[PDB]
Amino acid sequence: SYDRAITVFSPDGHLFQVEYAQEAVKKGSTAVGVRGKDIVVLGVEKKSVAKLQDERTVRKICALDDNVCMAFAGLTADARIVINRARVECQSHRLTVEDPVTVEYITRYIASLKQRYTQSNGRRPFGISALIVGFDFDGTPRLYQTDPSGTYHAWKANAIGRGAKSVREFLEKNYTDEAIETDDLTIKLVIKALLEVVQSGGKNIELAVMRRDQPLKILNPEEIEKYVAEI
Amino acid sequence: SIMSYNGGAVMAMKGKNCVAIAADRRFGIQAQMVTTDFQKIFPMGDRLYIGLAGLATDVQTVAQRLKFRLNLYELKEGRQIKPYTLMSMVANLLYEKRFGPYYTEPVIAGLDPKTFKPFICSLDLIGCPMVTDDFVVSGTCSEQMYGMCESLWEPNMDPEHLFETISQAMLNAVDRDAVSGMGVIVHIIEKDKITTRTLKARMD
Amino acid sequence: GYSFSLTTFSPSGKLVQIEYALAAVAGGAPSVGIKAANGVVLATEKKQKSILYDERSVHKVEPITKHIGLVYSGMGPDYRVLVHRARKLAQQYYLVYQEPIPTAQLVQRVASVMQEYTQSGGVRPFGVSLLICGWNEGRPYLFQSDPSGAYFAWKATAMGKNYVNGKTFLEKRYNEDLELEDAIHTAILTLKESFEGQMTEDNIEVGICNEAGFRRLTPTEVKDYL
Amino acid sequence: GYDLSASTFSPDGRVFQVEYAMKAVENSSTAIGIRCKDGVVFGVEKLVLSKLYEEGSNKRLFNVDRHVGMAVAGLLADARSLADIAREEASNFRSNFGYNIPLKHLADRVAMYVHAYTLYSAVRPFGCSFMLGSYSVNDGAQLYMIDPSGVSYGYWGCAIGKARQAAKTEIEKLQMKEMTCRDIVKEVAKIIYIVHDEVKDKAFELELSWVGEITKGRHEIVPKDIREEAEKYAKESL
Amino acid sequence: GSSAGFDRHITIFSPEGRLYQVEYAFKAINQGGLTSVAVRGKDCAVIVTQKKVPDKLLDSSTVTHLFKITENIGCVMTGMTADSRSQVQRARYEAANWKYKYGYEIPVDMLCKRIADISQVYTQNAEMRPLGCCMILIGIDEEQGPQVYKCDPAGYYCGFKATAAGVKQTESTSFLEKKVKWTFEQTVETAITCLSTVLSIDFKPSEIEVGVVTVENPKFRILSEAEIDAHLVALA
Amino acid sequence: SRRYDSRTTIFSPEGRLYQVEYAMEAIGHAGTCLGILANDGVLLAAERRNIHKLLDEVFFSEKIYKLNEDMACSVAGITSDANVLTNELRLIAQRYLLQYQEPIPCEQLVTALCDIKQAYTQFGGKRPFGVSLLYIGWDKHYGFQLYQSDPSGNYGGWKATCIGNNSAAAVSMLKQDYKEGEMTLKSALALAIKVLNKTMDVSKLSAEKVEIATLTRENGKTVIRVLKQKEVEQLIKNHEEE
Amino acid sequence: TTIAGLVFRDGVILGADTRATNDSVVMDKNCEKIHFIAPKIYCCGAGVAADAEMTTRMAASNMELHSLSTGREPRVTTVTRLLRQTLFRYRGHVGASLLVGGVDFSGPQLYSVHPHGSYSRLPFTALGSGQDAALAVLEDRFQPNMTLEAAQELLVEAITAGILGDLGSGGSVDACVITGTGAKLLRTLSSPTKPTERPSQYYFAPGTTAVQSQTVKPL
Amino acid sequence: DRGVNTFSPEGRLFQVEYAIEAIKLGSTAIGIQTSEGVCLAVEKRITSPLMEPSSIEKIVEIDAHIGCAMSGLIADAKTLIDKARVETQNHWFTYNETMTVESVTQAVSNLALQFGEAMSRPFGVALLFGGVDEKGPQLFHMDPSGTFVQCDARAIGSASEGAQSSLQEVYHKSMTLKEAIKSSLIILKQVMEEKLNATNIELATVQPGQNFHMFTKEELEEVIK
Amino acid sequence: TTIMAVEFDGGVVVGSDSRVSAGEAVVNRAFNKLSPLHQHIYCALSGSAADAQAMADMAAYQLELHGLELEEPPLVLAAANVVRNISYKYREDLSAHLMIAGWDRRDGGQVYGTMGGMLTRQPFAIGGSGSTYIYGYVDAAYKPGMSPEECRSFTTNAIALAMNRDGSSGGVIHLVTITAAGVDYQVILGNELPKFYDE
Ligand SMILES: *[B]([O])([O])[C]([C][C]([C])[C])[N]C(=O)C1=[C]N([C]2[C][C][C][C][C]2)N=N1
Known part of the structure; x- marks a missing residue:
């Protein structure tokens, strides 16, 4: 059995392997989340838009349960493992607490x-x-962000992946209450933010909205095109 | 006994360049009949069938584990298993559970994949083979089946005569058995075709 | 033991340890395999360092079963490991199916073991290439299994010292209608092209595979062919 | 670097790690063993590194069995571990076969245990050398020495430690074969006083133990009064 | 002579396809400075080895390189002493086990093969080095007669008519090469002569060790100082 | 021990996995493998590397392995590594059938194998498998499908794709010749030949240098067959006239 | 079951009946009870039929490996040691009662091996439910160093006694003659019993059997 | 390259020394123990304006009478925090009583050097344990080396050197909780890069008779004035 | 089964019956219950045939290895200890009493009873089902200072008396005399056994 210590402390007090894992996250596809009144908006850069690809087979946005969705950035194979571990956790929690898990x-x-x-x-x-x-048992909107080190924080709006800083810097000045007032207004903030890094913004962006007691309702090419058209 | 909990009877007969396998269709728990179309004979190749009698749960489990093993074998070896090789495969599977056995006595019937020579055999619950030249029986009414087979079986029977022989053997044998019956299914395996017939039988 | 791999991928996509294992095989004693119409012949050069060695004490051609024979080129002690493992694999198969393991099935299992040594922890790959022959369902077989775990079916082939010339010689001499006796003659001739000085019946080993089974040719028999 | 592991042979066929462990033994103080007609006498020049230590501290003479004594040189912690291994081996033999383990067999077992730490990178070679002395009516007097590589031999006289060469010359002058334990004790004391350095390693304590006909086959520390005569005699000699 | 990475430290293949660590183990056999010679007769096998004991305080009887594996199997070790002892201990165990599970005495060639197989594992696993010794085995086989086997650090083993190991191994091989191309007294004399000629030394009874096995008396036997002297006087 | 550890499963300074990238380099030089999905079936076309005249033919194929009753796959990269994964795929499919008494859906089989591949790149200290695979199959949920997975543990569904030698050039040709939802097995076979002719550098395409397998549905059952020399030879003839 | 063996002047003769029964009903009228272990070593099995079959197969396999490595002919003593060490391990649960016979370098050897792992080397033995009857024939007429034909007749009479006296035995007598030169497996050496000729008979015509459904599938 | 349990020439474990370096990059936490109780104040150090301040938890409850402030690698602290909670509940179950602050700190400390090649490295965090038992208000401090000690006033984190100086110049044995709470906030504000409001800091107290109490926004504002 | 061993000045005499029984049937009427563990060490078997055979083989193996390691002939006490160890460790599973007798250069002729894991040295020992009928006989007939011939005669008589009375004993009488010179085997057939009151 391989028992070598891979993650160790460096002279400056840093964990080299953890910092290298963060470098991998930077090369990942841009993902943007924004909190809303009674719906949460998740925008991920589709990037790979090949004409010989079966789009449905490579979705970044996934369902963890009937009430919680998530987007990721970085190593896609690592992501698939974590998503499935969480799915088992949600099932276990429903069989020992008789209630769905909170965000x-x-x-x-x-x-x-x-x-x-x-x-x-x-x-x-x-x-x-x-x-x-997602939304909790009552009905409040949540937006959390975890990273490679294992630290997580709640946010109003956040971005991850390539050029995350740029989308984060632009998100401070564009996030308000009027902007997230209506459901169709929560889709407007995201797209603009994504447009600051996504090449040829339009068909290179995937979308998803999580509502109240409603399943993963992915948006469609024309659905997203409407907003793109007006914009 | 555990072998009479669900009832059932299976028999295989050798003919001239052909084989026949038959079984009752009753699925019941002790005295109560549950269904009348329970499967006891499973295909294990183009011209190779296996009949399982005994505890219903083990009948399904053995058939499923054997299918699992045979499928892997066919992919790896790239060929159809020989009747005799299947018998050894089944014996090995049953012997693994020497102390905590599957309660089923399998009956194999088929023709070799290259020479089409008829083959029949019967194994016990531990996995001891009994290759014969005439017939093999298994189930709660084995004594009745032996009687019918011993006096009716003839060498070198053609497909039509073989069908009549095995049909009469099973019908009269299951009629003297309380927990066996509710229909009889018969498979006549020839080199060029498989014929499956359901017989008109007593439903009491 | 070490739990990490010793064979890894280099920048250009190669597994150098396997390549180095192939160099050990290439510097080994020459081995030839020829599939005839009714049998297979395995011939190997077995030149001792001196006359002090007892020729009939160790063999290079080994039976795995009654219908399967083996020969190698490369490291002798590594070859012993595989021979013992092949015999074990053949017996396991026989215990389950009550029939002699088909040559192709045995080669696959032996190759799988060799593949394991190129990825498992703290070990190097085997420094040997094998030539396997057999007779299943009225038909002869000839396979080659190398250090990486890859195996190929051959009509005729050569390994070890000067194998490249041996293969070219075989291509201009082998035909599909060849018979075992004729195959044995051209097998010895192939070894003669790369041989040093004076091929006798004590410095070469020959194994044959037909319908009767696989057997190592006796020195008396080899003398007649020479 | 060919000398970092015990599982690495150097180009000229040497295991440098085992040789580095032997250097540690050569830095230690001298211990000698003499086999005579009646038994075996052990003598150690135990250096007193501080005045704060009690007399008898860090002893280098052990009892591994009722009839077996052990004299060590080198890393004391390594040596103590080896003494425990030997004790367990003797006890195990008595349980399995019902009688006192023969010295030669005990020396073989311990040596192979020592040899096991010279083949891998996972462990390091023991840093000590030791002598095994014993006496029984059947076997007579026996004296074995085992070093860090695991090789063990029987001796008539042996010395280990820094002044092993100088001590050996002194031991060769004696005719121990026809001598008895009583007269050999004084000689052992004498040799240790001769090989002891004064300029370096000032202040030492003499440790003596024996096993033979005089102790009825029981290995024990030489009686104080008998050690007094030896110490007296050795002081006058040099 | 190319090298790469850790190929000179652990038992992994070098660019040429060589195992340097195994080659270094062969050099470790010569560190002891001794030479052994084994000769097979018509109905006997003889092993002779150099016996150097210049320490003087050493108990001569405990200094030996000849070992009894079983009642009918003897052996001579050459190379690192501690490595040799463990190999001898392993061989004794292998023989005892064979007898226990198969009901008959292990054939000399089977024992040599078993030891060679254990040695092979060290050349393939990186965590442990090969033993720096060589083992020569002798014994009488019911049908084949007298046997002489030898296995080395590489895991290679073979049967011989005559063989040698150690410092003067190459010259012993040459000397015996001509002779081979014999009664008990002739086989013994041949062995002593080879050793004496390659070492340029007029041997004395206590300077050599002799082990024998014959068809008449299969039990492995060590010659005494008086028995060796008789042969030494006949050679002179 | 630490001195010899090659550290196969660690992040490099720029967040990269060297062993995975080096294994991808090996797959890029291996034989060309192409997969095309049509309306009435799927196909697999792979270039053969074993072309020596003294080689014998006695197996189902060389690079095409049947996984179960409705699935087949093609491999590119280390041959012996592919044998290990292909055997594992067969076991995964049989284990699913033993449990649910139904054939495993195509995508579920690919995902299970990708999980094993991902595990090698994260822990254990072993070198990864140097194999890339192409899967073709039919299931009751999505019908005819085509998948491609690699050493990192990533996979994706495709209408047409290529792996191995000159796969980047093969993919370019496919983009300009593949008609989404208007392809047929006969029309897919022609495209395969066309693409294979370009990527391969040996003038005459040759029937002996390639292996083609098709997967179709016949009378409620999946049929997988490797085209024979005659059929392949005829296909090459068509291209000449084409 | 009646199995028996004797050592004669030049070798070993093994014998068995061919009846296999399930409780009190005959299941197999021609069960082969003399099994090959090695070219010059055979085994007769009594007791639990699946245990005998597996035990002898495992032994033959191990003995073949042994002979491939050593390159020599297997000894009868090795077979007895492998068998008895396996049976003792299972503490009698593997119900294999065997008669092991063979010829090796040391001459002909006969052993009886019992389920718990005990064994005995003897010049004649019998096992199975008909063992007392066969043993009575041997005790009454065995002599040492018999000729091949006298030993064949004696073993046949011993098996025949079990066949006629024990309800668990029947069918034919099979024999195995092992010598230094050859092995003669005489499956069906004597056929002392046979079904009666049968006076009348029964006949079923074309559609005597009423059929409900029918499917034909062509191959 | 060395192993994780390698000693340096000056007698120190490299990894333990590197873990102590990590504590210096963490937020400043202050602990003050007086006669009326213990107060714990920690700088939230919010990185961005879009980040929710309530999600940051540097001060937690171990049990009703024990509070805990962390500094350094927050993710590593969670493992220790849960261990501490389990220890006290196990103690309650077995002895039908509360665990003392010292005991809890001792139990958590015993997991610091348990690493090798099971933790593969030491924890990169420093802890402040404050609570009340039979000996009254108690403040303990634990670092990555497994060393734990009782303290009157202690600062850990990025600006611990500056905070300590102020602390030791303004701390006395008679000072009440109110003074401690005010004093600790005064020092926090002085070493904090950002402005000290009621949303960017954390405060909690534990007094005799009262449970672990985390100050609310309103209660901080009142005290912040 | 009836086994007996007697110590004499310079060696031991050990003997037994030859009957193996399964209920009322005699499965082997000429079985040899005297088994050599080493050149000068023997053991008599009683109880379960399988257990005794397995134990004897295990011990012979352990003693053989021990002898080659120590470079000398094993002591009789060592052989008894090895047998005692195995017998005590597996007392719950084994049903066999392995009586030990032999000669060594240190203690001469020694007889050890090791039934159930308990080791006891005696001048003479008797075991097996048939030994109960000869207790009175051996207590009244045994005399110190008996010669080997007398010991052989004493052993033959006792075994013969037990064979006549005990249903589990019978057949022939196996006899072995062990001394420094070696092992001497002897078989007293049915028609040559001592005759006493029979009708
Ligand atoms: B004696 O009666 O104690 C005798 C001594 C043995 C040979 C060491 N024992 C037996 O008679 C005896 C018989 N059996 C088995 C009975 C069932 C068949 C196999 C033999 N076990 N011990």
């Missing part, structure tokens, strides 16, 4: 798993960052 509860589990891979022998840290959204 923070699944974020905590995911963040805790990421932290465990930075202090375990024989393994490298996960090379991804995630944006978790």
Whole structure:
């Protein structure tokens, strides 16, 4: 059994492997989340828009349960592993607590798993960052963000992946209450933010909105085109 | 006994360049009949069938695990299994559970994939083979089946005569058995075709 | 033991340890395999360092079963490991299916073991290439299994010292209608092209595979062919 | 670097790690063993590195069994571990076969245990050398020495430590074969006083132990009064 | 002579396809400075080895390179002493086990093969080095007669008519090469002569060790100082 | 121990996995593998590397392996590594059938194998498998499908794709010749030949240098067959006239 | 089951009946009970039929490996040691009662091996439910160093006694003659019993059997 | 390259020394223990304006009578925090009583050096344990080396050197909780890069008779004036 | 089964019956219950045939290895200890009493009873089902200072008396005399056994 310590402290007090995992997240596709009144907006750069590709097979936005969705950035293979670990956690929680998990509860589990891979022998840290959204049992909107180190925070609006800083810098000046007033207004803030880094913004951007007691309702090419048209 | 909990009877007969396999269709728990179309004979190749009698749960489990093993074998070897090789495969599977056995006595019937020579055999619950030249029986009414087969079976029977023989053997044998019956299914395996017939039987 | 791999991928996409294992095979004693119409012949050069060695104490051509024979080129002690493992694999197969393992099935299992040593922790790959022959369902087989775990079916082939010339010689001499006796003659001739000085019946080993089974040719028999 | 691991042979066929462990033994103080007609006598020049230490501290003479004594040189912690291994081996033999383990067999077992730490990178070679002395009516007097590589031999006289060469010359002058334990004790004391350095390693304590006909086959520390005569005699000699 | 990475430190293949660590193990056999010679007769096998004991305080009887594996199998070790002892201990165990599970005494060639197979594992696994020794085995086989086998650090083993190991191995091989191309007294004399000629030394009874096995007396036997002297006087 | 550890599963300074990238380099030089999806089936066309005259033919194929009753795959990269993964795929499919008594859906099989590949790149200290695969299959949920997965553990569905030698050039040709939803097996076979002719550098395409397998539905059952020399030879003839 | 063996002047003769029964009903009228272990070593099995079959197959396999490595002919003593060490391990649960016979370098050897792992080397033995009857024939007429034909007749009479006296035995007598030169497996050496000729008979015509459904599938 | 349990020439474990370096990059946390109780104040150090301040938890409850402030790698602290919570509840179950501050700190400290090649490295965090038991208000401090000690006043984190100086110049044995709460906030504001409001800091107290109490926004504003 | 061993000045005499039984049937009427563990060390078997055979083989193996390691002939006490160890460790599973007798250069002729894991050295020992009927006989007939011939005669008589009375004993009498000179085997057939009151 491979028991070599992979993640260790560096002279300046940094965890080299964790910083290298963060570098991998930077090369990942841009993802943007924005909190709304009674719906959460998630925008991911589709990038790979080949004409010989079966689009449905490579979705970045996924469902963790019936009430929680999530987007990721970085190593896509690492992401698929974490998503499936969380799915099992949600099932376990419904069979021992007789109630669906809250947004923070699944974020905590995911963040805790990421932290465990930075202090375990024989393994490298996960090379991804995630944006978790949804609504709690009552009906309040949430937006969390976990990173490779295992730390997570709640946000009003956030971006991850390539050129995350640029989308984050632009998000401060464009996030307000009027902007997230109506459901169709929550889709406007996201797209603009994505447009600051996404090449040929239009058919290179995937979309998804999580409403109240409503399933993963992915938007469609023409649906998104409407907003793009007006803009 | 555990072998009479669900009932059932299976028999295989050798003919001239052909084989026949038959079984009852009753699925019941003790005295109560549940269904009258329970499957006991499973295909294990183009001209190779296996009949399982005994505990219903083990009948399904053995058939499924055997299918799992045979499928992997066919992919790896790139060929159809020989009747005799399947018998060994089944014996190995049953012997693994020497102390905590599957309660089923399988009956194999088929023609070799290259020479089309008829083959029949019967194994016990532990996995001991009994390759014969005439017939093999298994189930709650084995004594009745032996009687019918011993006096009716003839060498070198053609497909039509073989069908009549195995049909009469099973019908009269299951009629003297309380937990076996509710219909009889018969498979006549020839080199060029497989014929499946359901017989008109008593439903009491 | 070490739990990490010793064979890894280099920048250009190669696995140098496997390539180095192939260099050990290439510097080994020459081995030839020829598939005839009714049998297979395995011939190898077995030149001892001196006359002090007892020729009939160790063999290079080994039976795996009654219908399967083996020969190698490369590291002798590594070859012993595989021979023992091949015999074990053949017996396991026989215990389950009650029939002699088909040559192709045995080669696949032996190649799988060799593949394991190119990825498993703390070990180097085997430094040997194998030539496997057999007779299944009224038909002869000839396979080659190398250090990486890859295996090929051949009509005729050569390994070890000067194998490239041996293969070219075989291409201009081998025909599909060849018979075992004729195959044995051209097999010895192939070894003669790369041989040093004086091929006797004590410095070469020959194995044959037909319907009767696989057997190592006796020195008396080899003398007659020479 | 060909000398970083015990599982690495150097180009000229040497295991440098095992040789580095032997250097540690050569830095230690001298211990000698003499086999006579009646038994075996052990003598150690135990250096007193501080006045704060009690007399008898850090002893280098052990009892590994009722009839077996052990004299060590080198890393004391490594040596103590080896003494425990030997004790367990003797006890195990008594349980399995019902009688006192023969010295030669005990020396073989311990040596192979020592040899096991010279083949891998996972462990390092022991940094000590030791002698095994014993006496029984059946076997007579026996004296074996095992070094860090695991090689063990029987001796008539042996010395280990820094002044092993100078001590050996002194031991060769004696005719121990026809001598008895009583007269050999004084000689052992004498040799240790001769090989002891004064300029360096000032202040030492003499440790003596023996096993033979005089102790009825029981290995024990030489009686104080008998050690007094030896110490007296050795002081006058040099 | 090309090298790459850690090929001179662990048992991994070098660019040429060589195992440097195994080659270094062969050089470790010569570190002891001794030479051994084994000769097979018509109905006997003889092993002779150099016996150097210049320490003087050493108990001569405990200094030996001849070992009894079983009642009918003897052997001579050459190379690192501690490595040799463990190999001898392993061989004794292998023989005892074979007898226990198969009901008969292990054939000399089977024992040599078993030891060679254990040695092979060290050349393929990186965590442990090969033993720096060489083992020569002798014994009488019911049908084949007298056997002489030898296995080395590489895991290679073979049967011989006559063989040698150690410092003067090459010259012993040459000397015996001509002779081979014999009664008990002739086989013994041949072995002693080879050793004496390649070492340029007029041997004395306590300077050599002799082990034998014959068809008449299969039990492995060590000659005494008086028995060796008789042969030494007949050679002179 | 630490001195010899090659550290195969660690991040490099720029967040890259060297072993995975080096394994991708090996796959790029291997034989060309192309997959095309049509309306009435799927096909696999792979260039053969074993072309020596003294080689014998006695297997189903060389690079095309049947996985179960409704699925086949093609490999590119280390041959012996592919044998390990192909055997694992067969077991995964049989285990699913034992549990649900139904054939495993195509995408589920690919995902299970990708999980094993991902695991090698994260822990264990072993070198990754140097294989890239193309899957063709039919299931009751999505009908005819085509998938491609690589050493990193990533996979994707495609209408037409290519892996191995000159796959980048093969993909370019496919983009300008593949008609979404207007392709047929006969029309897909011609495109395969066309693409294969360009990527390969040996003038005469040759029937002996390639292997083609098709997957179709016949009378409620999946049929997978490797085209024979005659059929392949005829296809090459068509291209000449084309 | 009646199995028996004797050592004669030049070798070993093994014998068995051919009846296999399920409780009190005859399942197989021609079960082969003498099994090949090696070219010059055979085994007769009594007791639990699946245990005998598996045990002898495992032994033959291990003995073949052994002979491939050593390059020599297997000894009868090795077969007895492998078998008895396996049976003792299972503490009698593997119900294999065997008669092991063979010829090796040391001459002909006969052993009986029992389910718990005990064994005995003897010049004649019998096992199975008909063992007392066969043993009575041997005790009454065995002599040492018999000729091949006298030993064949004696073993046949011993198996025949079990066939006629024990309800668990029947069918034919099979024999295995092993010598230094050859092995003669005489499956069906004697056929002392046979079904009666049968006076009348029964006949079923064309559509005597009423059929409900029918599917034909062509191959 | 060395192993994780390698000693340096000056007698120190490299990894433990590097873990202490990580504590210096963390937010400043202040602990003050007086006769009326213990107060814990930690700088939230919010990186961006879009980040929710409430999601940042540097001060947590271990049990009703024990509070805990963390500094350094926050993700590593969670493992220790949960361990501490489990320890006290296990203690309650077994002995039907509350665990003392010292005992809890001792139990958490015993997990610091448990790493090798199971943790593969030491924790990169420093902890401040404040609570009340039979000995009254108690403040303990634990670092990555597994060393824990009782303290009257202690600062950990990025500006711990500056905070300590102020602390030792303004701390006395008679000072009440109100003074401690005010004093600790005064020092926090002085070493904080950003402006000290009621949303960018965390404060909690534990007094005899009262449970662990995290000050609310309103309560901070009142005290902040 | 009836086994007996007697110590004499310079060696031991060990003997037994030859009957193997399965209920009322005699499965082997000429079985050899005297088994050599080493050149001068023997053991008599009683109880379960499988257990005794397995134990004897395990011990012979352990003693053989031990002898080659120590470079000398094993002591009789060592052989008894090895047998005692195995017998005590597996007392719950084994049903066999392995009586040990032999000669060594240190203690001469020694007889050890090791039934159930308990080791006891005696001048003479008797075991097996048939030994119960000869207790009175051996207690009244045994005399110290008996010669090997007398010991052989004493052993033959006792075994013969037990064979006549005990249903589980019978057949022939196996006899072995062990000394420094070696092992001497002897078989007293049915028609040559001592005769006593029979009708
Ligand atoms: B004696 O009666 O104690 C005798 C001594 C043995 C040979 C060491 N034992 C037996 O008679 C005896 C018989 N059996 C088995 C009975 C069932 C068939 C196999 C033999 N076990 N011990």
